[PDB]
Structures are given as structure tokens and as C-alpha cells.
Amino acid sequence: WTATSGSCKGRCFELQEVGPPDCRCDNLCKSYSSCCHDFDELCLKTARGWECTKDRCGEVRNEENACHCSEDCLSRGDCCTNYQVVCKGESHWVDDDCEEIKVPECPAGFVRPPLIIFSVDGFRASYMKKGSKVMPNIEKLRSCGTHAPYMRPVYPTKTFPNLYTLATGLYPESHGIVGNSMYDPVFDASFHLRGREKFNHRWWGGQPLWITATKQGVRAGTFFWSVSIPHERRILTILQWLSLPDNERPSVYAFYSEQPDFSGHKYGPFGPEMTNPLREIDKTVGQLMDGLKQLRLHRCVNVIFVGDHGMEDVTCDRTEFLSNYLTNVDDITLVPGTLGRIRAKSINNSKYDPKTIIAALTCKKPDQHFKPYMKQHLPKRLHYANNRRIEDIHLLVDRRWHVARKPLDVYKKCFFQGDHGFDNKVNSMQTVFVGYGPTFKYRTKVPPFENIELYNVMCDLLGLKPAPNNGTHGSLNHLLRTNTFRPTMPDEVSRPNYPGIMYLQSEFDLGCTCDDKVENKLEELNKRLHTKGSTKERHLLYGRPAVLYRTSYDILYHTDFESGYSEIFLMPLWTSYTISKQAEVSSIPEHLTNCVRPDVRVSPGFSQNCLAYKNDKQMSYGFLFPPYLSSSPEAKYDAFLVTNMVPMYPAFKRVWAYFQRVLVKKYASERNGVNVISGPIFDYNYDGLRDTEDEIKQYVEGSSIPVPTHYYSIITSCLDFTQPADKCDGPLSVSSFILPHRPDNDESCNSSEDESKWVEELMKMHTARVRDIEHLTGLDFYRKTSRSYSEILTLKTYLHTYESEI
Ligand SMILES: *[C@@H]1O[C@H](CO)[C@@H](O[C@@H]2O[C@H](CO)[C@@H](O[C@@H]3O[C@H](CO[C@H]4O[C@H](CO)[C@@H](O)[C@H](O[C@H]5O[C@H](CO)[C@@H](O)[C@H](O)[C@@H]5O[C@H]5O[C@H](CO)[C@@H](O)[C@H](O)[C@@H]5O)[C@@H]4O)[C@@H](O)[C@H](O[C@H]4O[C@H](CO)[C@@H](O)[C@H](O)[C@@H]4O[C@H]4O[C@H](CO)[C@@H](O)[C@H](O)[C@@H]4O)[C@@H]3O)[C@H](O)[C@H]2NC(C)=O)[C@H](O)[C@H]1NC(C)=O
Ligand SMILES: N#Cc1ccc(Cn2c3c(c4cc(Cl)ccc42)CCN(C(=O)CCc2cnc[nH]2)C3)cc1
Ligand SMILES: [Ca+2]
Ligand SMILES: [Ca+2]
Ligand SMILES: [Cl-]
Ligand code: NA
Ligand code: NA
Ligand SMILES: [Zn+2]
């Protein structure tokens, strides 16, 4: 109920919202049909259009005008944006040479450079190059300012999850907006794109930038605009806000454009119809910059031009229907489209069973265009599991495709030619970033980065302390001229023990055997030094990882690898080794086929035992440092130590063995040596964070050996690959993975073929940032390099995507 009896006179686009039933004049009132009767007449004036003309110059002010060309307009801050160009012979901002902005050039009374966020919905990264001819203002922003070739959105690459990530620096699973559409089983309520419940408040977690600004005494324009407010009026309103007195004037502003997403849905990302929407966005940017230039603010304000997601080609004819797979299709609810989420239509259905559903959806058609997942088995890089609103069963849909429940849903509910929502590493989903202003760098290109990082930077640009978030604060320091954030390394919480030889062989009753008992001061002194850490500088290139939680662990040195061995989990937290370009792959000798050796430095009570594996019919074991890469036959005995052993399902051993025997040597020759750190991950509650010991849901049968949910590796080399990994003078280069530790290979449809046809593809799917592995392990890597810490934070957020060029 809005008794829209009040008025909007003197209240047009009021920053503070009003409480029902007093009628609203804020820029969202249209959306809720709750404006004052006079809102259109007073706030959405249009008369005479949007531009000054020669004959309007120095006119007498007429309040019916959309914008003014009179003499006082600059004082009032309500000139048309082209006023000084037409009436004072100035030039359009786009026609000025650019000039480095070394310091803010702001009017008296400005306490900090304002930030204007200019967000565009559906603006695909490749539009920057492909549309460059029809977007001269944006092209000037891009070339004169700081820009990335593209920005990675979060998954799902939908509008609401991404806009709210941009505002909070949080993954959807944490801020709670996990979809454009959602169901919350605890509230028993749905969140809908269109209408009410959207706006209830309880849906939104974290702390968006506008609330962060307010709480710290920085005033915010609104970040929301009704669709019927013309773009030109949006710009004019921001320009007017910028003319307010110092005590009232906001410091952060957002403009939102429904385009080019709106047209891209209809015509596809590159439909011929796409050119005009691109020209119109550019024209709007032109208006903003001319407007700012007029107010003398065009060298004072920081401007971010940013997209939520890209846009892919998708049509009705590329739809997979679950009714082709499931006989029980009426017992399920599907959230459909460029992703799938399935739950039971009825919770009183006790015959509903996710395993049989998953099985009926698994590799059923030769070119099947989606893949089913329990959400905890989704690639960890997607961070899309830890929310009650994300259904247990997820479908990852191929780019260009849709999944639907039944044919009736498509033709009885072809319109569209574009859609988005797909995996966030898909090229067509990538979006844009350009920063322009005194606080950003001049003519600088920066590497691609993830949109979760931006909140921190927008906080830096405003002098704010960001709320706790998923960005890595400092990893975007190289975008900024000043206002950088200089974090310190976290402090090591646990210090390692360095055990020496303290146990006799016969103290071990582990059920293990090894044909090794066949043994000299040349090489007896030598081997002792290897156990003391004499080759450690070769295998621990960047320092040892710091353990960031309370635990008890040992450092174990060997000729070919160094390890940090947990006495709590009975296996290494990490194992580090270097493989040079020249390194040779050997095989496991026959006599050592099932060799496991007791480690005389670690008590039987802190060791694994072979009998548990023998008894455990589903579980086998593998090694973190691969016997295949031993430097000598003598060094190869170290690789069979019980303290290098980890629990592995036979199905996973196929993956791990191919990685260790084939891929590490391959990377070593392609990269000129690599350093590898591998280990286990335990994330049974799928929250993306290291489990404590009481969170482990599975052990090797009859023992206290915990079973990892994942195995990671971090592969580091010199960015300049003419230098060997162990002799690198400058910037590093990394790729990493977090492989699910699974009892079958159902994820890989081709897995009954040779590992050379399927393993590398599975690994690419499960690519990770080192930062992902840090959260999952409580470890902190690259402690001792000669690089700046900010540069190392950038390296740690890098994701190797294996997509071809943008
Ligand atoms: C990405 O960044 C984000 C932000 O940094 C990281 O998320 C944080 O993770 C923290 C550690 O897991 C978590 O800390 C917990 O806080 C609990 C109190 O939570 C409330 O207060 C915070 C602060 O204001 C608030 O943000 C929370 O909001 C959540 O909840 C509502 C919906 O439920 C949403 O509006 C909102 O979106 C957000 O949801 C998300 O977080 C929760 C977890 O908090 C998830 O479950 C949701 O699915 C969703 O993802 C809350 O309003 C506090 O209870 C916790 O403390 C327990 O555990 C500690 C261990 O330290 C123990 O000492 C305590 O005793 C306590 O245990 C007791 O309670 C248990 C639970 O009831 C019970 O089982 C036990 O038996 C004990 O009795 C804990 O400290 C923090 O809330 C979030 N913050 C956010 C914004 O998500 C995120 O991890 C990063 N991701 C990665 C991959 O790095
Ligand atoms: N960088 C950046 C940036 C810019 C703006 C915002 C703010 N914002 C906006 C939307 C939104 C959804 C969520 Cl879950 C959270 C925040 C969100 C929807 C579209 N938006 C509209 O203004 C149309 C409104 C409308 C559409 N139909 C009726 N009204 C903007 C957040 C980040
Ligand atoms: Ca076994
Ligand atoms: Ca966990
Ligand atoms: Cl969705
Ligand atoms: Na023996
Ligand atoms: Na398979
Ligand atoms: Zn869209």
C-alpha cells in the first residue's frame, strides 16, 4: 500500500528511501509502482531532448526542460552534457589527447576522488577489440587507463550472482545469491528474478560496497536504477549529485546498463543487431565524460568500466531433455538452462534417490552435452557447494547448450539466440575491466583477474577497510598508482620438528615388506647429509610452506624431495621436489613392486601400516614423491618410505600414475625444469577450507589413516623459460590442480581408454589457484622468494584455464 498522496517536488531521486505509505521518489520507486503521482512530471522530464543546440545557448531557464543550456546551469550542475561544447566552443572529451593524470585535480571541498562504477550487463570481453571501431569513448578509457584483456566472472555466470559478487568480493555460496532463481529450504521461499521476495533482505549476506561506505562515513549514490529511467537521465542525476554541497555529496556512484545483455539474448553475442546497442553504450560513456569535463571533474574522478559476464550463442535446438534419460522425470524439479540444479519435487517422496538419478545421467549418449555432479564433486575452482540453496545434484552444461526437464518447457513456455551461466572459465563468458582516473595507472595493461578481487580495490580507492571477503587483498596492487594495500605474510602458527634416526626397524609391526636389505664412507657420509637437508635448496626453491594452524608435524629431508609430515593425519601435508629439463624417468624395479619401508625417523605410532590397505578392499596407496623420478637407484629407496605413502582408490591411481610418470617430465621439458609441491586435501564438508581431524568422514578400514577428498599439485617454473626452474632471476610462472579423489572414473566418459586420451582433460577441468589450495590446506606458499609480496599474491590468484586466446 502506497497512499501516493505526498509529492516529489524537491525530492527527485532522493538518496534516502522513504517508509510506506508515503510515496517514494527514489530511483527504484518505478520498479515497485510506488512513486508519487507527480514523479514522471517532475523527475522524468524530456522536453527539448538531451542535447544543447546553438539556438538554445544562454536561453532563459525553463524548468520543463530535460537538461538546461542557460548561463546558470553549471552552478546548478544540470546542463545538458554537451553544453560547453556547443555554447562555449569546448571539445568533446573523446577528442582530447589523453594526458597522464598524476594526481587528483579536484574542486575545493572534495575530500577524496569520487568513484564512478559504470557496469554493463552482458558485455563480453571480446567486444573491447571487436567493437572498438564503434566505441571511441570506451576505447579511450581502455587505452589511456588501466585495463585487463578480460575479467573472470564467478560461477554461475548469471547477472545477480555476479553483480552481488562485484559489490561484496564474496563467492555466491557465501553471499547467498547462488542463482538468478533460487529455493531456500529453510525459509521455504523462492527468490525470483521478477517481482517481490526479491527485496525481503534475508537473502543477501556479506556486506556490499554501499553499506561498507556508509558505515565508515562515506556517502553512496544508489547502485540500482529502474529500467524505465532513461540512461541519459541516469547520467544527469549522477552529474547533479556530484554538484551537491560537500556535506551531502556522495563519494561512490554506480550506473547500470541492461545492455548489451538484453539484445545479446535476442540476437546472439555477435548478431548484426548488436552494433547499435554497443554504439549507444559508448554514447552514454561519452555523456558521462563530457558532463564530468564540464564540471571540471574529468581528472578528479576514478571511473571503473566493468561487466558482470559475457554471452554465448545458444538456441532452442541445442537443448538436452532429462525426459530422454530419466523415466521418473515428474518426481524432480529442475532449475533449467545453462546450468542444471535438481532436487526432489516432493520431500515426502522416500523413493527419490540422488545416486540413481546421477547414474541415469552419466555418460548415456556419445556426445552428451552436460555432466552430472554431486555438488561436492564439482571442480573446486567454482567454489559452488557450501550453501543450502545449491541443490545436491548439479549439471554442468556445455557451452552453447541448454538443459531442460521436458520438451514442453521450451516450445510451450525459437526466441533467444544468446545466453550465459556456463562454467566461469569459458571464453565467451569472460567480461571486461577498465580503470581510468588519478588512482589508476596510465596506459597500463594488467593480467586477467577475477571479479571477486574488485571489492578490495574499490575499498582502497575510497579509503575504506573492506569487510571480510574472498579477494586476496594486495593481489591487484599493480592496477594502482597509489592507495596500494601492503599486507604482511601471515605468521607461522606451528613450528616443525626435525626428527633424526630414533627407531629401530624391528620396532615396526606394520605388515610391510621390502626387498631392500642388500647394502662405505664415501657414500655413507653423503647419504647422512641428504637426510640432514643438504640438497634441500634444490627441492625447496621458495622456502618451506608455513603451517597456519596448530598441529604437530615433522620436516623430512631426502636426496630427491623434502616433506612436511603430519603426525595427526599420518601423511605429508606437502611434499616438495624439483625436476630439471634433463631429469630421466625410470621405472619401479620388479623387486621393489610392493615395497614399503619403515621410516626410522617417525614412530610406528605415527606411521601408516600396510595391513590396513591389504584389508581395505576398496583402498590402495600411492606416493607423493614418484619413484619414477628418483635421481639414482640408491635414491629410489627413499620414495618407498611409509612416510611418502598416501591412500588412493585404484581408479584414482590411474590418474595419479599418469601425472607422475608422464606429465611431470613433460612439463619439465616444456618449462625448463619445474618445482612440484603435492599433497592431500580434506574437505568433507565442502566449505573450501581445511578440515580439522574431527571432520573426516572416511578412514582406511580398521585404521586411523584418514582418506583425502582431493590431491593437489603446484607446479612452478621461471616465467622466462630460458632460465632453469632452480636458477630463476625474476617472475615465476605457476599452474596447479585440485584433483577429486574418487573411487571410480565416472566423471571421465572416455576413461576405459588409455590415460593419454582422458587424464589431461580431467586435470584441466580441475585446474586451481594456489590460493584455492591454501584455504583447503591452511598452508602458505612462496614465503622466501626475491619477489615483492604483492607480485606473489598475484601469482597465487593466477588460474591456468587452458582456454585458447580471448
Ligand atoms: C570467503 O569469505 C567469506 C567471508 O570471509 C568466508 O566466510 C566466512 O567463513 C567463516 C568461517 O567458516 C564464518 O565464520 C563463522 O561465523 C558464524 C557466525 O556467522 C554469522 O555471522 C557472520 C559475521 O557477520 C555472518 O556473515 C554470517 O552470515 C552467514 O549466514 C547467513 C545465512 O545463514 C547469510 O546471510 C550469509 O550469507 C552467511 O552465509 C554463509 O556462511 C555460513 C557460515 O557462517 C554458511 O553456513 C552459509 O552456507 C553461507 O556460506 C552469520 O550471520 C559462527 O557461528 C562460526 O563459529 C562456529 O565455529 C567456530 C569455529 O571457529 C566455533 O569456535 C564456534 O563455537 C562456532 O561453532 C558453534 O556453532 C556451530 C554452527 O552453529 C555448531 O555446529 C557448533 O556445534 C558450535 O556450537 C564461524 O566463526 C563466517 O560466517 C563466513 N562469513 C561469510 C560472509 O560467509 C569464506 O569462508 C571464504 N571462502 C573461502 C573458500 O575462503
Ligand atoms: N559493479 C557493479 C555493481 C553495480 C550495481 C549493483 C547493484 N545491483 C543491480 C542488480 C543487482 C542484483 C543483486 Cl542480487 C545485487 C546487486 C545488484 C540488478 C540490476 N541492477 C538494476 O539497477 C536494475 C534494477 C531493476 C530491474 N528491474 C527492476 N529493477 C543493478 C551491484 C554491483
Ligand atoms: Ca587394498
Ligand atoms: Ca572443510
Ligand atoms: Cl540460476
Ligand atoms: Na626389509
Ligand atoms: Na568413465
Ligand atoms: Zn542475461
Swiss-Prot record:
Region of interest: Required for secretion: 773-794
Organism superkingdom: Eukaryota
Ways its activity is controlled: Inhibited by vanadate. Inhibited by micromolar levels of bile salts, such as tauroursodeoxycholate. Not inhibited by taurodeoxycholate. Not inhibited by hydroxysterols, such as 7-hydroxycholesterol, testosterone, dexamethasone and prednisolone. Inhibited by EDTA and EGTA.
Cofactor note text: Binds 2 Zn(2+) ions per subunit.
GO cellular component, one term: membrane
Keywords: Calcium, Chemotaxis, Cleavage on pair of basic residues, Disulfide bond, Glycoprotein, Hydrolase, Lipid degradation, Lipid metabolism, Metal-binding, Obesity, Repeat, Secreted, Signal, Zinc
Residues the record lists as binding Zn(2+) 2: D261, H265, H420
Motif segment (Cell attachment site): 76-78
Coiled-coil spans in chain: none
Tissue and organ distribution: Abundantly expressed in cerebrum and cerebellum. Localized in secretory epithelial cells in the brain and the eye including choroid plexus epithelial cells, ciliary epithelial cells, iris pigment epithelial cells, and retinal pigment cells.
Residues binding 1-tetradecanoyl-sn-glycerol 3-phosphate: T159, N180, D261, H420
Cystine connections: C8-C25, C12-C43, C23-C36, C29-C35, C52-C69, C57-C87, C67-C80, C73-C79, C98-C144, C106-C300, C316-C414, C363-C749, C512-C610, C514-C595, C718-C728
Annotated spans, Phosphodiesterase: 94-447
Consequence of substituting H265Q: 20% of wild-type lysophospholipase D activity
Pfam families named in the record: Endonuclease_NS, Phosphodiest, Somatomedin_B
Site, Essential for catalytic activity: residue positions: K796
PANTHER family xrefs: ECTONUCLEOTIDE PYROPHOSPHATASE/PHOSPHODIESTERASE, ECTONUCLEOTIDE PYROPHOSPHATASE_PHOSPHODIESTERASE FAMILY MEMBER 2
Free-text note on domains in this protein's UniProt record: The nuclease-like domain is most probably catalytically inactive as residues that are essential for catalysis in the DNA/RNA non-specific endonucleases are not conserved. However, it is required for the stability of the protein and the catalytic activity born by the Phosphodiesterase domain.
Function: Secreted lysophospholipase D that hydrolyzes lysophospholipids to produce the signaling molecule lysophosphatidic acid (LPA) in extracellular fluids. Its major substrate is lysophosphatidylcholine. Can also act on sphingosylphosphorylcholine producing sphingosine-1-phosphate, a modulator of cell motility. Can hydrolyze, in vitro, bis-pNPP, to some extent pNP-TMP, and barely ATP. Involved in several motility-related processes such as angiogenesis and neurite outgrowth. Acts as an angiogenic factor by stimulating migration of smooth muscle cells and microtubule formation.
Name of the molecule in the record: Autotaxin
Organism of provenance: Rattus norvegicus (Rat)
